[PDB]
Design a protein around this ligand. Sequence first.
Ligand SMILES: O=C1C[C@@H](c2ccc(C[C@H](NS(=O)(=O)c3cccc(C(F)(F)F)c3)c3nc(-c4ccccc4)c[nH]3)cc2)S(=O)(=O)N1
Length: 296
Amino acid sequence: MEKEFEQIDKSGSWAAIYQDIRHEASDFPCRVAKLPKNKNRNRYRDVSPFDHSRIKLHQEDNDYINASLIKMEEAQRSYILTQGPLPNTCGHFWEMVWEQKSRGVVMLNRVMEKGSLKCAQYWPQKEEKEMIFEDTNLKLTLISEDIKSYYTVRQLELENLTTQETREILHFHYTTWPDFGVPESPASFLNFLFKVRESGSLSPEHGPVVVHCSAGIGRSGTFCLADTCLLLMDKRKDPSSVDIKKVLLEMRKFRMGLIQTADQLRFSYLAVIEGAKFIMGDSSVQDQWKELSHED
Ligand SMILES: O=C1C[C@@H](c2ccc(C[C@H](NS(=O)(=O)c3cccc(C(F)(F)F)c3)c3nc(-c4ccccc4)c[nH]3)cc2)S(=O)(=O)N1
């Protein structure tokens, strides 16, 4: 993997590889996403879910939400990639989290980046100020949070008002990954990813973990691509079979535009190559990552 990485650098073909990937990416319809009544449910006109993999709300009125089920069959894991909820779709977002039985939500953007709204405040910032979604009859309360230097983990309690039932939702919020950019290093990224893994939110006993940035394809796609590649290196009886570009192309069958820059793909490689050390058996990399991420 680093052999090919190595050879792309000198060749200066990171952009060429990435542009080929764009050209070879699946191109399915998004007829439901482009319906006129669903226009105010899509933050970006050019980022829609394919009709075949979109998530359907269980409400008998409008079942649309800009979100896609990415089902990696060989890796044995599923992810729900969605956009940053909009002021009017926050009820939709939690309805989906509830109906799909998700246990965790991975946020990789910030509500405001470089002076621009990229996502609505869809979770309670203060314990004493819970939120109520009346269109979906749901309640959401912040129970506790763990604030690190570049990311925060929050315990939330979503409650189905109708049935009076509640569930614990773990929110993993990466707060230092810039738009159209990359994490500060593989170390920080991996430390964060394993934090989500160690929590149980990605277990097969739960519904698809929900991942998102602003548009839900760039940072979200980088996160998911790296996680899946490492899942496969650990499965296959040989981590050298894993072709990231082939894996990316497979993921783009479920959602368009996964990985938005040539540099993000190059970070992907860097993340997987580094992550590989842990899969192999190195029982010291994880802690080094944490101590290298300066999470305090
Ligand atoms: O790393 C990232 C990039 C973010 C991202 C990715 C795509 C969009 C869709 C954005 N959609 S719009 O609706 O704001 C937009 C902007 C330009 C053209 C366009 C056509 F539909 F193609 F005409 C739509 C969009 N922005 C551009 C950029 C931005 C800067 C420099 C170059 C290109 C092109 N499309 C928004 C956020 S993410 O949160 O998914 N993670």
